[PDB]
C-alpha cells in the first residue's frame, strides 16, 4: 500500500523552470490539483525527489515507482533512462529502462527500486530520481508522481 | 497544486494497530492501493505525520489538509478536533474543528494550517496532525490522506 505520493513540483528538475525544455500542466488527481511535468525537449534530463529517512518507518521494505506517459511526439528514448534510489549511508539502487517503442498516451509505473531502514539509520536524505545526461535530446515524457509503497 | 499526499500508514496513530479501536481498509486511490484508517472507537485520538523540512522548498507558502469521512454511526464529535502543524524551529499552527452534525459518507478536506520555510530553516521534522485526548469516545472517522499544497 502507498505511503506517499510526491508530485513533480516537489522534485528538482534540471531546466524545469525553462519553457524551452519543460512545461507544467494542471490536472485533477482524484480531487487533488496536481501539475504534470511535461518534457518538450532536454539533453540534461534529471528529476530528483529528496525525502528524509525520518519520513519512513524502520524494518519495513519500501518500493518506489515513477508514473510517466510518452507523448505521440516522444523521441530520444534509445538511450537508457537511469533509475536511482540513494540512501544517506551512500548505498544506491541503480537500474535503467529503455523507453524507445513503448505505446504512447498510456500511464505506466516504472519501478525505481526498494530500500529498508535498519539500526541507527534513523535520519538523512533519501534521493529518488531518474536521469540521462547524454548529448542527445529527450522529448515527450510527462511525469505524474513518485509513489513509495510498503 | 499538491506536492505530497501522505496516507495514514505513513502516520503514527495511538492504538492504530489495535482492532478494538482502529481498522484499516484497502481501497484504490487513482490506481494506487491505499489503506484508509477507519476509527471504530478511541478516547486518545492522535494521528501524526512527520516529514522533514528538507522535503520542502524555501520561501513558498504550503497549506496542509486532512481528508476524512464521518460514518453513519459517527459519535463523540461534540468535542473539538485539534489541528496542528509543528515546525522544527518551535512554531506551531494550532486550530480546531467541531465535526458534530457534518453530513456522513462524504469526503471533506480539513485545512490544518499553512507554513513557510525561510532563512536557514533547511531541515528538521515538521509534524502534521489532529488529536482529541478527552475521556469521551470518538467513533466513525475514516482518514484518507494528508495533502500538502503550494
Ligand atoms: C537544455 C539542455 O539540456 N542543456 C544541456 C546542458 O544543461 C548541458 O550542460 C551541463 O548542464 C549541467 C546541468 O546540471 C551542468 O550545468 C553541467 O556543468 C553542464 O555541462 C550540456 C552539456 O552536457 O548539454 C546541453 O547544452
Ligand atoms: C483505547 C483508548 O483510547 N485508551 C485510552 C488510553 O490511551 C488513555 O491513557 C493515556 O494514553 C496515552 C497514550 O499516548 C498515554 O499513555 C497517557 O499517559 C495515558 O494517560 C486513557 C487516559 O486518557 O484513556 C483511554 O483508556
CA distance A50 to A63: 15
How far is CA A124 from each of CA A59, A96, B4, B53, B57, rounded to the nearest angstrom?
16, 25, 19, 12, 17
Q: How was this structure determined?
A: X-ray
Q: Do B5 and A55 touch (CB under 8 A)?
A: no
Residue B143: beta bridge partners? B37, B68
Query: What is the enclosing helix (H) or strand (E) of B51?
Result: strand B45-52
Query: Going from the N-terminus, what domains does chain B have, and what CATH number goes with each?
Result: 2-149 (2.60.120.260)
CA distance B95 to B79: 13
In this structure, are residues B146 and B128 in contact, taking their beta carbons and an 8 Å threshold? Answer: yes
Burial (CB count within 10 angstroms: exposed 0-12, middle 13-18, buried 19+), residue B129? buried
Residue A136 CA to ligand 1 centre (angstroms): 11
Nearest CB to A50 within list B5, B30, B55: B55
How far is CA A68 from each of CA A23, A76, A107, B18, B70, rounded to the nearest angstrom?
14, 15, 6, 38, 34
- Taken as a whole, chain B contains a residue count of 150
Question: 3-state DSSP call for residue B58?
Answer: coil
The H-assigned helical ranges of B82-127 are none
C-alpha cell belonging to residue B30: 487513482
Residue B139 CA to ligand 2 centre (angstroms): 16
Closest by CA to A83, choosing from A41, A115, A35, is A115
Instruction: Report the b/e string of B19-44 with b at 16+ CB within 10 A.
Output: eebbebeeeebbebebbbbbbbbbee
Residue B45 CA: nearest ligand 2 atom is: 3
CA distance B56 to B62: 9
Phi/psi at B41 (nearest 5 deg)? -160, 135
CA distance B49 to B7: 9
B147 to chain A: closest CA residue: A32
The number of angstroms, rounded, from the C-alpha of B67 to the middle of its chain's C-alpha atoms is: 7
Measured in angstroms, the resolution is: 1.9
CA distance A109 to B89: 37
C-alpha cell belonging to residue A30: 482524484
Closest by CA to A67, choosing from A33, A112, A113, is A112
Amino acid at each position: 500500500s502507498t505511503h506517499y505520493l510526491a508530485f513533480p513540483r516537489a522534485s528538482t528538475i534540471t531546466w524545469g523552470d525553462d519553457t524551452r525544455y519543460w512545461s507544467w500542466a494542471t490536472v485533477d488527481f482524484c480531487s487533488y490539483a496536481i501539475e504534470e511535468a511535461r518534457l518538450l525537449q532536454v539533453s540534461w534530463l534529471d528529476c530528483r525527489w529528496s525525502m528524509d529517512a525520518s519520513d519512513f518507518k524502520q524494518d519495513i521494505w519500501y518500493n518506489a515507482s515513477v508514473e510517466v506517459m510518452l507523448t505521440s511526439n516522444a523521441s530520444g528514448w534509445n538511450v537508457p533512462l537511469h533509475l536511482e534510489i540513494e540512501l544517506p549511508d551512500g548505498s544506491k539502487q541503480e537500474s535503467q529502462i529503455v523507453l524507445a517503442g513503448r505505446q504512447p498516451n498510456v500511464w505506466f509505473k516504472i519501478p525505481i527500486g526498494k530500500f529498508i531502514l535498519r539500526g541507527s539509520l534513523t535520519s538523512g536524505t533519501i534521493r529518488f530520481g531518474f536521469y540521462n545526461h547524454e548529448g542527445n535530446w529527450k522529448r515527450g515524457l510527462n511525469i505524474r508522481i513518485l509513489a513509495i509503497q510498503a
